[PDB]
Design an enzyme around this catalytic site. Structure first.
Site, PDB file in Angstrom:
ATOM      1  N   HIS A  12      -5.299 -16.489   3.658  1.00 45.99           N
ATOM      2  CA  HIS A  12      -6.392 -17.394   3.877  1.00 45.99           C
ATOM      3  C   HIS A  12      -6.981 -17.997   2.872  1.00 45.99           C
ATOM      4  O   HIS A  12      -7.912 -18.853   3.171  1.00 45.99           O
ATOM      5  CB  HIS A  12      -7.687 -16.662   4.698  1.00 45.99           C
ATOM      6  CG  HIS A  12      -7.016 -15.930   5.974  1.00 45.99           C
ATOM      7  ND1 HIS A  12      -6.415 -16.710   7.201  1.00 45.99           N
ATOM      8  CD2 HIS A  12      -7.118 -14.512   6.372  1.00 45.99           C
ATOM      9  CE1 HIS A  12      -5.955 -15.948   7.870  1.00 45.99           C
ATOM     10  NE2 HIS A  12      -6.356 -14.656   7.635  1.00 45.99           N
ATOM     11  N   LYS A  41       4.385 -16.997  11.652  1.00 42.70           N
ATOM     12  CA  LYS A  41       3.085 -16.777  12.017  1.00 42.70           C
ATOM     13  C   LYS A  41       2.480 -17.952  12.965  1.00 42.70           C
ATOM     14  O   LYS A  41       2.511 -19.176  12.489  1.00 42.70           O
ATOM     15  CB  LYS A  41       2.076 -16.541  10.892  1.00 42.70           C
ATOM     16  CG  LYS A  41       0.784 -16.017  11.196  1.00 42.70           C
ATOM     17  CD  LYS A  41       0.115 -15.554  10.004  1.00 42.70           C
ATOM     18  CE  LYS A  41      -1.096 -14.875  10.254  1.00 42.70           C
ATOM     19  NZ  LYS A  41      -2.405 -15.396  10.417  1.00 42.70           N
ATOM     20  N   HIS A 119     -10.463  -9.975   7.368  1.00 46.31           N
ATOM     21  CA  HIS A 119      -9.847 -10.441   8.430  1.00 46.31           C
ATOM     22  C   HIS A 119     -10.382 -11.864   8.598  1.00 46.31           C
ATOM     23  O   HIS A 119     -11.919 -11.908   8.474  1.00 46.31           O
ATOM     24  CB  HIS A 119      -9.771  -9.858   9.847  1.00 46.31           C
ATOM     25  CG  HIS A 119      -9.330  -8.597   9.923  1.00 46.31           C
ATOM     26  ND1 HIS A 119      -7.733  -8.411   9.841  1.00 46.31           N
ATOM     27  CD2 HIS A 119      -9.740  -7.399  10.082  1.00 46.31           C
ATOM     28  CE1 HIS A 119      -7.476  -7.126   9.930  1.00 46.31           C
ATOM     29  NE2 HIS A 119      -8.717  -6.629   9.832  1.00 46.31           N
ATOM     30  N   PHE A 120      -9.624 -12.859   8.948  1.00 41.59           N
ATOM     31  CA  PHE A 120     -10.485 -14.226   9.548  1.00 41.59           C
ATOM     32  C   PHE A 120     -10.299 -14.152  11.003  1.00 41.59           C
ATOM     33  O   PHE A 120      -9.505 -14.352  11.732  1.00 41.59           O
ATOM     34  CB  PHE A 120      -9.482 -15.573   9.028  1.00 41.59           C
ATOM     35  CG  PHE A 120     -10.161 -16.844   9.085  1.00 41.59           C
ATOM     36  CD1 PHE A 120     -10.072 -17.429  10.263  1.00 41.59           C
ATOM     37  CD2 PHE A 120     -10.876 -17.369   7.912  1.00 41.59           C
ATOM     38  CE1 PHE A 120     -10.679 -18.490  10.417  1.00 41.59           C
ATOM     39  CE2 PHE A 120     -11.370 -18.306   8.112  1.00 41.59           C
ATOM     40  CZ  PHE A 120     -11.540 -19.120   9.234  1.00 41.59           C
ATOM     41  N   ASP A 121     -11.740 -14.235  11.326  1.00 43.98           N
ATOM     42  CA  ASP A 121     -11.894 -14.164  12.960  1.00 43.98           C
ATOM     43  C   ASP A 121     -11.735 -15.594  13.577  1.00 43.98           C
ATOM     44  O   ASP A 121     -11.098 -15.656  14.462  1.00 43.98           O
ATOM     45  CB  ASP A 121     -13.271 -13.634  13.023  1.00 43.98           C
ATOM     46  CG  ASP A 121     -13.302 -12.650  14.643  1.00 43.98           C
ATOM     47  OD1 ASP A 121     -12.337 -11.975  14.818  1.00 43.98           O
ATOM     48  OD2 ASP A 121     -14.138 -13.129  15.368  1.00 43.98           O
TER      49      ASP A 121
HETATM   50 CL   LIG Z   1      -6.109 -17.491  11.021  1.00 44.37          CL
END
Ligand SMILES: [Cl-]
Ligand SMILES: [Cl-]
Ligand SMILES: [Cl-]
Length: 124
Positions: A12, A41, A119-121
């Protein structure tokens, strides 16, 4: 195995440029960040801010995560981001991504000591 913080960085962070500058950005970055190894992904956002600025989000606005946990944080400011999403036709191992550059708030889940993004929410 990769630490959660390190995986977040790899998936990210892209502090090297202020914004994507090409429709091919996602194809290149998804490949170079090793996000297309055994499967493409399907969705992945890169943040074009310093790592320190992204880490700082973990002390910004506390919000619920999509999963209902309460270790998410929404950035006070918008950030430059590039959303990568597989096209509807994309077929591993020939992954193909749409690149969408935007300036939006980010929402990250944070954990650990130091308390950092894992985490990227979502963006808003
Ligand atoms: Cl993402
Ligand atoms: Cl970890
Ligand atoms: Cl890797």
């Amino acid at each position: 195995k990769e630490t959660a913080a390190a995986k977040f960085e790899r998936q990210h962070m892209d502090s090297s440029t202020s914004a994507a500058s090409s429709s091919n950005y996602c194809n290149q970055m998804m490949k170079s960040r090793n996000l297309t190894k055994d499967r493409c992904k399907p969705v992945n956002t890169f943040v074009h801010e310093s790592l320190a600025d992204v880490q700082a989000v973990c002390s910004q606005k506390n919000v619920a995560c999509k999963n209902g946990q309460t270790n998410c944080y929404q950035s006070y400011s918008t950030m430059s981001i590039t959303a990568c999403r597989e096209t509807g036709s994309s077929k591993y191992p020939n992954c193909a991504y749409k690149t969408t550059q935007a300036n939006k708030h980010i929402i990250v889940a944070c954990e650990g000591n130091p308390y950092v993004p894992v985490h990227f929410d979502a963006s808003v």
